[PDB]
Structures are given as C-alpha cells and as structure tokens.
Design a protein around this ligand. Sequence first.
Ligand SMILES: Cn1c(C2CCOCC2)nc2sc(N3CCC[C@@H]3C(=O)NCc3ccccc3)nc2c1=O
Ligand SMILES: Cn1c(C2CCOCC2)nc2sc(N3CCC[C@@H]3C(=O)NCc3ccccc3)nc2c1=O
Ligand SMILES: [Cl-]
Lengths: 428, 428
Amino acid sequence: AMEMNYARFITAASAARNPSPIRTMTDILSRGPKSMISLAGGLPNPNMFPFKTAVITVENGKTIQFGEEMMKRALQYSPSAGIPELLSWLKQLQIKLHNPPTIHYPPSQGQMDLCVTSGSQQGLCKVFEMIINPGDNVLLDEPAYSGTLQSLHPLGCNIINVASDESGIVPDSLRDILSRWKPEDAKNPQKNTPKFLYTVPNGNNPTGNSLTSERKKEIYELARKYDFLIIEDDPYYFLQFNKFRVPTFLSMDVDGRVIRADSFSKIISSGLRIGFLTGPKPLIERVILHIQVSTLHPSTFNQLMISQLLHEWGEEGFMAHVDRVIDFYSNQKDAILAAADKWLTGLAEWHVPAAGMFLWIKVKGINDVKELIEEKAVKMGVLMLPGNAFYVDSSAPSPYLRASFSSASPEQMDVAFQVLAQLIKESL
Amino acid sequence: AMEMNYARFITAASAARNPSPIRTMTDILSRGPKSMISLAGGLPNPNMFPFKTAVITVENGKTIQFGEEMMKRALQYSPSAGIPELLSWLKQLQIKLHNPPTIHYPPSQGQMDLCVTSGSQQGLCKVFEMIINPGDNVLLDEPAYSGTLQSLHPLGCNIINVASDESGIVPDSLRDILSRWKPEDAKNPQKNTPKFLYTVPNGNNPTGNSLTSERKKEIYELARKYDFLIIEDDPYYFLQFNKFRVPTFLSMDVDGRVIRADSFSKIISSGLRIGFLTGPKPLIERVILHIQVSTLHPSTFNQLMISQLLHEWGEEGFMAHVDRVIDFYSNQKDAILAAADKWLTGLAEWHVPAAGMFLWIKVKGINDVKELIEEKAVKMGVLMLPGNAFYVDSSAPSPYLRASFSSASPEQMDVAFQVLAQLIKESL
Ligand SMILES: Cn1c(C2CCOCC2)nc2sc(N3CCC[C@@H]3C(=O)NCc3ccccc3)nc2c1=O
Ligand SMILES: Cn1c(C2CCOCC2)nc2sc(N3CCC[C@@H]3C(=O)NCc3ccccc3)nc2c1=O
Ligand SMILES: [Cl-]
C-alpha cells in the first residue's frame, strides 16, 4: 500500500466545493428525536404530483409495482450519491466481482466508495473536471471513444497517445512514454508527470480489443511507479465473450489509484441514465459535491425500477441476465465476422472483438474511407462509421470503419459488406 | 434590439467544445435514402433490456401506457436537448405564457432555443460553467439560494451583493452598484463589468419575495445599459399566489440577454429530474454540447411520461393542474401565517410570501438563531432552517429562519411556532 496524496489529483476549484447545507440538516435531525416537526427542508409536497401508481413488466422476474407511497418517493428528491438500497446492492456486487483491496481502508487512504451517476459518462466528465488543469498530461490509447476525446478537448490537457493493439494498450509503449520523466518527478508538480491513464479495458469503443490480465499487471506497476491514477471506463465489463472475465484494475488496486465507471447502458437500459463510479473516497466525495450543484441526483424513479429488479433477481438472476445478453452479442459477433470473411478477405484487415458491440475494420489501399462511406455508400443505403472521430486529430485520414453488430440481422450485414466490398473494389 | 456579442459570455473552454460525431452521422443519414442499413451508430440493442411494458396512473387524465415499442424507445438513448415532442410542447408553452421577442430572430442574434435538462439546476450549473472565468463579477441578491452560492463558490467569481426587500431585488441598489463602471466599459473586458445578474424573480428561496413588473423593467434597462445577461432562475413561476402572473424577464427580452430556467420540480415531479432552459441559441448550444459529454440527455423514460401527460392534458389541463397546486400552497401559506400571527407577533418580523414554499422569519433580539434551533429546538422535536446558508459569508450570524409550508398540517405548524416562541422568550 503506497501512501496516496489525493490533493495532487483535485483542482483548486474542485477542492473549494463545500458540503451541502442539506447534509448538515440531516445530521442534526439524526442527533435528535424521531418524533419531529421539521420545516427546515426544501422538499415540495409530493401529493401534488400527477403520477400516482406504476406497474412495469419484466423478463424472468415478478412485475415491479409502485404503490401510492413508493410512487411519492419515486417522484421526490433523493440522495446525491444514489438511493441507499441500490448503493448497497452495487457495493456487494463490486465486492463479489472485483474484491477490491480498498474496501476496509480508512476514508483518507482511499476507502472504496460508490456513487450512482446519471449514466457512467456523467461520472467521468465530473472526474475529468476534478483532475485536469490546462497543460496537465494525460495518457490514453487512440483509437479512443469520441465522447472521451470531446470531453477532454476543452479542458486543455495534453493527451499523450499510448500504443494499442489486438490486446488493448501496449504497456511496453507506456513504459517508453513514461521514461521521459524520472519516477521522483511525481513528487514535483512543476515536472508535470501524467495525472492519469484512461482506458476502456474490455471491448474498446471503437476497436473491440480487450486488455489481458498480464498487461493490466504491467500497467498497474507503471501507474504505481510514476504515481498516476487509472481511470477504468468499463461499460462492456458485462459484455465479455470469453468464459472467464479478465480481472479488473479495481481488483488489483492495492494503492487506491483506480477510479472505475460501470454502465448499465448495454445490459439494463441506456435511456434510464443510471451508471456508477467506484473509487477512492476523497475523489468520489469531490464528484458527489459537483453532482449536488448540477443534477442533484439520478432519477429517483429509475433507480427504484432498477433496484427492485436487482433485489428480486439477486446476484444470481442478474448474472443469468448478463449471460443471456452476452450470448446474444456473441451470436451477432459471429454473424458479422462471417459477413466480413465472405466479402472482405483480401480487401480489409480486422481482429475478432473480445467484447462489446463493434467490429473495427481497416480498409487496405484506401487512405481515407470518409469519401467512400459518405458520398457513395450512403447513396446506396449502407453506412458504417469512418474512424476519424476516434483520434485527437480527427481531420487526419483514417482507413478504419467502426461497424456495430448490436442490431443488424445476418441478411442486413451480408448486404452491407457486399456493398462495401463493391465500393472498395471500384476505389482502388 | 441591441446587437449582442455572445463570445463575451462564453469561456475559452466552452467555446472549444466541438459538435457531436453523432450529429454529423444523423445529418448524413438525412441526406440519403430511408431504406438504410446503418452499422455506424453506437446504440445497444434495446430488446436485451429487462423492462417490457409500463402502465402509470394519473390525476384527471387517461392512464399512460408504454407498449413494447414505446418501452424500447423509453429505455434507449435519445437527443441531448430532449425528445422532440416534449421540446415542441414546451416551445409552444413558452410562446403562450411569455411571447418572447427572440422567437423569430436569426440564430446568431439570440433566437429562442430550448433545452430539456436533468432538472433545472443542471441547466444553470452548465450556464455558470459556460460564463465564469475566475475574477469575473456577477450580481445577485442575498439572501440567495444555497445551491446557487455553493455552485458559484468554486468558479472564483466575485459575487457583488445587490440589495433586496419585500419586492425582490431593489433596482435602485443595482443602479448604484453599476455606477462603479461607465456603460462603455462593457466593450472592454479588462474593466471587468458584470457578466450577469442572477435572480429567482418569483418566491425567492429562502425569502418568499417576488419581483414586481415595474422593477423588472428597471432591471432590464440596467442590464441593457451595462450589457449583462439576466439569469432568470424561476422554479416557482407556476406557484404564484396572486391571480395575474408577473411578466417574466424572458417576456421583455428584446436583446436576447435572458437565460431562463423553468422547473417541473414543485408542480410535476422533483425526483424525475426534468427541467428546461430557455435562452439565446448561441448560449443554449454551448450548454447542449456540455450535456453531450456528461449526462448525454435526461432520462428518455421520464421525458416520455411527462410528454404524454402534457399532450393529453393540453395547455388547458396543465394550467388547471398548476391552479390546483397554487390553491394547495396558498392554503398552506395562509395556515403558516396564522401560526406566525398567533405565536410570534412582537417576537419576530416577516413578510407575506408572494409565491413558493417558504416563510422567512427574522427573530428580534437574538443575533444568531443557530444555537436556539440546533441545540434547543431539536431536543424538543422542532426544526426550522437557520438563515446562515443563504449568504456568501455563511459563518456570519443570522437572525433569520426559513420555514417551509409545503408539507406540515396546521396542527404541526401551531406546535412548531409555539415551541419557537417559547425558545425565543427564554433566550432574550
Ligand atoms: C431533506 N432534503 C433532501 C433529501 C431527500 C432525501 O435524500 C437526501 C436529500 N433533498 C433535498 S433537494 C432540496 N432542494 C433542491 C431544490 C431546492 C431545495 C432546497 O431548498 N435546498 C436547500 C436546502 C438547504 C438546507 C436544508 C435543506 C434544503 N431540498 C432537499 C431537502 O430538503
Ligand atoms: C444514433 N445515436 C444516438 C441518437 C439516439 C436518438 O436521439 C439522437 C441521438 N444516440 C447515441 S448515444 C451513443 N453512444 C453513447 C455510448 C457510446 C455510444 C457511441 O458509440 N457514441 C459515439 C458515436 C460516434 C459517432 C456516431 C455514433 C455514435 N450513440 C448514439 C447513437 O449512435
Ligand atoms: Cl451534469
């Protein structure tokens, strides 16, 4: 256990955030009798709200019902970090799946803390705003999620690009990048050593490539040596195609240097906007205070829908669900790889996605696929995504295409790649 | 119509935000045939989601039903600014209620644009982050909403306090404050003239005081003369106790200098996290791009619940609803004023709230009510909120108490003020 200095990863603005007056009140109300008349809060009267009951049908589960009182709770303000029954369910899930070393650490030493967020990306945006001053160095691997790049761009950090391949980030690249600094330079803020490494360790959007166990051990040792955070943005953790899931950065986080984002967006609902951050208490605390002044909390309604489903499923029923979803996406993956093999062998290069929704295709011989897709393929009713958007320099030419296998039938994929092959052939 | 320079109210970070790759795609898909096979998106497959149908009962309205297809939409990603049917409903509401002069202006000249936000406060936090560099001057009236003060604190602006009274902000105070600068200094950023005036013009949290029509005309002329924005945070617009609602700043916004936040939190649901910003297109556009990288959008589910209710109600059914809510809060107001009259006449000063949920009570003779409330009243099962939290300098003594009349019965209020009166009497 290396002694962390979280002040180093919190901006002056972030550190200036004071606690809610609401929490001061609720703590006074606890040190005091339950038979209480409080006119001190700012809750509106929930009996004025026009939604009264809710019945919601479910796969392989008892129907979810909001009675009159539960509905009034669902329509009312709730805690910033999330409703307690969901938070505690999720805390038990994280202990079962990742058994983080930080569980029983003291708060100031990076004790594991959770925060339910309005989607996992709200969590990360908050994390990036917490950490980054202009001119700070951050590490990631291009191709990278376009949302992350669009989020980091206005913050004025320098993105130092780490090499990646079929197995995610190449730690051998990271090591060479870091040799620029001496390990002692982490103790000196004028030397400007990397604040963090961001990655999507399973099923990277857009590549489909997942890190291996061994590479995560190497990355963690480098993060320990040069004393940076690892931001583990892991929305396809529950869409891994291999039988045994790869150990997370969180699971090996002896130092309390890992902030993890989990997403319900591909397994439970994207539209509900319920994800969660898991990380060291001092950093999670900063994120929570920012949420207090922006969204206040994620939808109470949508949390109670998800929490009731998860409590009646149990961990067993939840993991049975993710297994059915993995099976679906694994068949879709096999279908798109078949269409790839049939139409693009000799015209394009690609790897087998280890997780997620995307096949990432390099077109041989064509420097920029943007003209082929946007001017020709579109007019023929086919579209894949040019790779341009997944690099910091998006105006640079890209031969790559991101192709989602989430929705399309085998009949549609076949047509799509036949058209692509035809267009590649008439462009060379 | 004064020609605005919105660049003046956008930070370098905010201006650096580029458009979504998602919007580039959707625009390509429009310039192209409808019979389309797109593997270019990142939507997960919504048939994997475990919620299948929803039935939700309603006051004075046909039950809301999500069929299988509508549920899949409700659980899926949706536009950043909000779902189109809600946005267009809300745009028509704003035209009926406020008839803003900016409706038919060109986009660059401050054309009225709406954004559905995850609560109205998300909108404002985004607005504050968009505008404020450290050392910028901003205008507001203390006592001010604690959330606003906690949000502005880490941004490092100077809050210049404008006087307020029974009728909100005193424009005569504002005028004297602004005479510090010459009107020409708005054209020179080194002179550091106020970026904006923030206020809650109806039923201020915590005071209950609402601006008059005449005072809004004076404030607007001052905002025109010294060329600042008016941020109209108006969550109690639909909780006004007088018959005729006071014209909004938005309604008089000839220049496109008004950003308005409306809230559904006291009339429809606080817990659902659905509010909206109305403002000039260049500023709303910046807020939307920030939402794109944080929450992505407000819950699609909760938007469709609200939109279906609002479409079946019509504007008539909605305004009939707000009228019933106003009636409820007006009776609650009358009840708390009766308890005030009975127990506190000669012990405390207060005004009749013009709107909202709060009575604001000045205790005579006691410098700091914090000790009386937190050490004595609590142990006797009564609590009101010390006023400390509603000033920039919160450690300064406050004789004021915010007392909500949203929930408590007349029996409870009577006990609360009898206890308060007893405690005031034994403190002098
Ligand atoms: C008890 N409570 C809760 C608890 C709901 C259960 O989960 C834990 C939080 N939440 C909220 S949000 C909220 N707001 C936001 C709109 C404006 C209104 C509000 O006046 N704020 C300021 C405030 C200052 C001091 C004390 C009290 C309030 N007030 C409350 C509130 O009073
Ligand atoms: C069509 N569409 C919509 C539309 C839903 C209807 O309302 C208007 C928006 N929304 C979203 S959100 C989303 N995300 C977020 C998680 C990651 C995933 C995603 O890969 N982003 C990146 C992206 C880049 C370029 C093109 C496409 C996607 N993808 C979509 C999406 O593809
Ligand atoms: Cl946010």
